[PDB]
Amino acid sequence: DIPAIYRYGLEGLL
Amino acid sequence: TVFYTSIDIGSRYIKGLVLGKWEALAFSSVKSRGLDEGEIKDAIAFKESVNTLLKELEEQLQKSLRSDFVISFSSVSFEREDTVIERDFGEEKRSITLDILSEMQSEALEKLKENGKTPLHIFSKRYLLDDERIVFNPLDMKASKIAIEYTSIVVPLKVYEMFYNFLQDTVKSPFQLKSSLVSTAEGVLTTPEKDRGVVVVNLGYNFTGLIAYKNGVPIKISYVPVGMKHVIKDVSAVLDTSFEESERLIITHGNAVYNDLKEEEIQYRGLDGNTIKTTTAKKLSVIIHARLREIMSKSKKFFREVEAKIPGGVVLTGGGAKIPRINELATEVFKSPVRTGCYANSDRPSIINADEVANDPSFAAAFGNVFA
Ligand SMILES: Nc1ncnc2c1ncn2[C@@H]1O[C@H](COP(=O)(O)OP(=O)(O)OP(=O)(O)O)[C@@H](O)[C@H]1O
Incomplete structure (x- = not known):
């Protein structure tokens, strides 16, 4: 399972 | 007492x-x-x-x-099942009594115990007299024939047992x-919600439960196989910590809305339970927001399948309904009124x-x- 954050392309906020 | x-x-x-x-x-x-x-x-x-x-x-x-x-x-296995019970009194009219209604409902329940399933809830959905007269309450009415449509919520016998x-x-x-x-x-739910139409979204642990009411009874029941367990899992994965530390962070500092969050460092433990690590309330909320957005987007399919058979809007329930500002997120995804149940x-x-x-x-x- 890939966390939703990546699948929604919000990982730039990490 | x-x-x-x-x-x-x-x-x-x-x-x-x-x-x-x-x-x-x-x-x-x-x-x-x-x-x-x-x-x-x-x-x-x-x-x-x-x-x-x-x-x-x-x-x-x-x-x-x-x-x-x-x-x-x-259980993900709850489902809606319907049945009709009829009485035909012959060439004479008879009063519809409590005994008659009790008998017909008992009979419906026995009829719903089949195909490896058993009813947990039963609702009288429609009452039809003499093959033409629809009534709201049959009690004390006289009729040659009565037909009652029941809707129930059933579960597999194996699960029940x-x-x-x-x-x-x-x-x-x-x-x-x-x-x-x-x-x-x-x-x-309020009575008008159950009457006019409303959807409950239950933000539970293993999955998200979905139930719609109209005319006072459930009309659809389903689920999305994504729940708060996956929110906790995502946080544990991204922050590289235990399930329980992740849960602590979410309950203590989580928010469904991240864009306007002030800079706020927060500490947590690694898998070793001793190494101190640091993230921010904003980063924590981004991880939560994304999974919550997924849950709601997937629930929208249910909402649209019901939107064929929503005045009352959406009522969020369960543990997840307590995440700060989740109602804002839901309103944006569902495009309808949302309240906490x-x-x-x-x-x-x-x-x-x-x-x-x-x-x-x-x-x-x-x-x-x-x-x-
Ligand atoms: N105050 C809170 N703020 C944010 N999240 C919470 C809060 N309380 C509980 N949760 C989250 O909700 C989850 C538990 O909620 P709930 O009580 O619906 O679970 P449950 O009833 O055991 O699940 P299910 O109904 O699916 O069996 C926890 O995993 C936690 O992540």
Whole structure:
């Protein structure tokens, strides 16, 4: 399972 | 004086409530163990968990549990099933009595026990007299024929028997089993909501439960196989920590909306339980927001399938409904009114000493088990 954050392309906020 | 003990068995928490007739005599929430994805995978642990709740309830009461138990549980296997029962009295008209209605409903229940399923809830949906007259209440009316359409919420016998057998070995009292999702809806909805149309989204642990009411009864029941467990998993994965530290962070600092969040460093432990690590409230919320957005986007399909058969909007329930600002997110995704469901905001009289639990979306089913 890939966390939703990546699948929604919000990982730039990490 | 009449007492009720209501237990709601969730995958993460077991909720307990003792009500007397209204006042709350005792209430507690204990960690649920031995249930893994709606199946009892450790009966020993499960029994321990239940006993822990019973002991806490007794400790609060200072008296042995003497009531009727109503106990609800969650399962992805609940479904809607309908049946019709008819009476044909012949060439003479007869009064429709309580005995007749009781008999017809008992008969519906026996008829719904088939194809490996068994009913937990039954609702009288339509009443038709003499093949032409639709009435709202058949009682005391005279007719040559009556036909009643029932709608029910059923569950596989194997699932039912699993819970029933273990509970009867642990709860030393007669009890009735119910659907936690149905009881949740019964615990939070107002009468006009149930009449005109409304959808309950229950943000539970293993999955997200979905139930729609119209004309006073459930019309659709389903689920999305994504829940708060996946929110916790995502945080553990991204922040590289344990499930329990992740849960602590979410409960303590989580928000469904991240864009406007102030810079706020927060500490947590690594898997070693000692190494201190640091993130921000904003980053934590981004991880939560994304998974919550997924849950709601997937629930929209249900919303649209119902949007063919929504005045009352969406009522969020369960543990997830407590995430700060989740209603904002939902409103944006569902494009409709959204509110938090709890017993207090249903259309029913306040209950003495219930302040702490009446406003808790987590205790909705516990209340609903009783006020059905
Ligand atoms: N105050 C809170 N704020 C944010 N999240 C919460 C809060 N309380 C609980 N949660 C989340 O909700 C989850 C438990 O909620 P809930 O009581 O619906 O679970 P459950 O009833 O055991 O689940 P299910 O009904 O699916 O069996 C926890 O995993 C936690 O992540």
